[PDB]
């Protein structure tokens, strides 16, 4: 789909409120082409229309949109256009989409404003109650270890930081089966100890605010006495049941830049559908997201996994503002993947047919993710600006 | 919002502001001030910028200090003025200069004297720590905006300090059309920086 988008024969320019369509055809007039347009706040559609395309080879057509709606509700407006072929051809069926483009129109920043959670402390755990919800923080490890709704547990694995991904083929990058490379990303990550780094607790403190409970933690990931990353987190549980998570991460400048900065947990539930507001509907990466469109997407859980024959990191969706799994909701600005296979199993399994689904559902939420490269698969090919080379990182997440 | 809480060993101040022009919200700032028992004030800032407004020149803080000190000491880039667009010649080290050297006297007054990549800044009794860009001088931004010749500038009562988490490039390919490259513009939509005072 990325190849189809980049190769498309119509190019679009938006100068409010005029869409300029340029044909890259050399010989044929646009006689089987219809331009559909749509404006959405979240999708949540607001307006749409249809304009036939009448453009000469290498010509230009100006399309004037009617008065676009201006809602007072907060949110970002998006304009999406698609070129549709209404008549079948020798090689395509009626309704074939041949080109598309999206833009941001106008944003309205949200300026509005919104029982007291009870904190119980023991030498092993910090435990918080609010009505029928409970959160448990393991004071020895410093991670959120369990969450309750009613009497049912929600986590099989604690919520912890993650800085590694199951290596892509571009990460392994060893053309001949015998010609080992110390410059490949996976070899640098292994030698630096990114896959074996142990988290050491630096601080775990709880305070009861006037209307919320504040949990502050800090961890250091170390390999043979060298500190690779430092994570500082604040968990804020308010009276509305939402848990706001703030993360600040420092990366040592002399270590290879990490594959990702994010969180990882294994959920107990196995739901049937995944609903998110972000880029989609297909798998997309910071290096490979020009074809994805911001909208409301709904897919079966199986569609969230790309079955590459050689297993690797897969199924990421970037630019996500909201994610709905079974009972849960996460809100922020993050990249996520969600599947029945952990990163470790994908790393250790050489064929897709040998993968076995795990007990619950693995969720990775990343503030930041490295590019995938692809100029070639036998040398490092991730451009310098898609590497996680900044010294410090910050992201925020709300779990409701 | 403006809320205060007393922690076990610190005081927490939480604020939020919205900058508006004719009913349109341009920027939103959310800040936490944490004053601990060691006397230091840790400031955390998160800023949201409306996507349809022109990208701002800077994101940062500004205050006028009462005292006027003689020297500025700091751990950051270069001895000379440097900008995100123009810092390849500056060197990271400890620099000490008189306060007058922190102002570049362009004949037509404008924004000047910025130093990027700064981890620590000392002025008088105060110390700021983080990762920021700063300029410090006797002239406010308003006076520089309003004055057409450098000889008409008048030193103000104290010293003006601007500390920025982020600053847009200066351009320079030509001076008669926009020339700041797209990656030197403040277009990310969301911004975060942290500062410790004393």
Curated annotation (Swiss-Prot), chain B:
Feature type site, description Important for ensuring that an appropriate proportion of lactose is converted to allolactose: 176
Signal sequence segment: none
Chain positions recorded as substrate binding sites: 176
Domain of life: Bacteria
Expression induction: By allolactose.
Family listed: Belongs to the glycosyl hydrolase 2 family.
Assembly notes: Homotetramer.
Protein name, as recorded: Beta-galactosidase
Full-sequence range covered: 825 to 1022 of 1024
């Amino acid at each position: 789909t990325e190849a189809k988008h980049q190769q498309q024969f119509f190019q679009f320019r938006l100068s409010g409120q005029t869409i300029e369509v340029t044909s890259e055809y050399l010989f044929r007039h646009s006689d089987n082409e219809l331009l559909h347009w749509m404006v959405a706040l979240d999708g949540k559609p607001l307006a749409s229309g249809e304009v036939p395309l009448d453009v000469a080879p290498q010509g230009k057509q100006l399309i004037e949109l009617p008065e676009l709606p201006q809602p007072e509700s907060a949110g970002q407006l998006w304009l999406t256009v698609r070129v549709v072929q209404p008549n079948a051809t020798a090689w395509s069926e009626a309704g074939h989409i041949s080109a598309w483009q999206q833009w941001r129109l106008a944003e309205n920043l949200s300026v509005t404003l919104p029982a007291i959670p009870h904190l119980t402390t023991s030498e092993m755990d910090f435990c918080i109650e609010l009505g029928n919800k409970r959160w448990q923080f393991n004071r020895q490890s410093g991670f959120l270890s369990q969450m309750w709704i009613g009497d049912k547990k929600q986590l099989l694995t604690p919520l912890r930081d993650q800085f590694t991904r199951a290596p892509l083929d571009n990460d392994i990058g060893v053309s001949e089966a015998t010609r080992i490379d110390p410059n490949a990303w996976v070899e640098r990550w292994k030698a630096a100890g990114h896959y074996q780094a142990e988290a050491a607790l630096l601080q775990c403190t709880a305070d009861t605010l006037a209307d919320a409970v504040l949990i502050t933690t800090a961890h250091a990931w170390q390999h043979q006495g060298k500190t690779l990353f430092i994570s500082r987190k604040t968990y804020r549980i308010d009276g509305s049941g939402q848990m706001a998570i703030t993360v600040d991460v420092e990366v040592a400048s002399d270590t290879p830049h990490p594959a990702r900065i994010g969180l990882n947990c294994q959920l107990a539930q196995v739901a049937e559908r995944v609903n998110w507001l972000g880029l989609g509907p297909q798998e997309n990466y910071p290096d490979r997201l020009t074809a994805a469109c911001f909208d409301r997407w709904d897919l079966p859980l199986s569609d969230m996994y790309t079955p590459y024959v050689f297993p690797s990191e897969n199924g990421l969706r970037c630019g996500t503002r909201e994610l709905n799994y079974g009972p849960h909701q996460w809100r922020g600005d993050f990249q996520f993947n969600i599947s029945r296979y952990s990163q470790q199993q994908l790393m250790e399994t050489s064929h897709r047919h040998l993968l076995h689904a795990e007990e619950g559902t693995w969720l990775n939420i990343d503030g930041f993710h490295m590019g995938i490269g692809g100029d070639d698969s036998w040398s490092p090919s991730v451009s310098a600006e898609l590497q996680l080379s900044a010294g410090r990182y910050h992201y925020q997440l709300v779990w409701c």
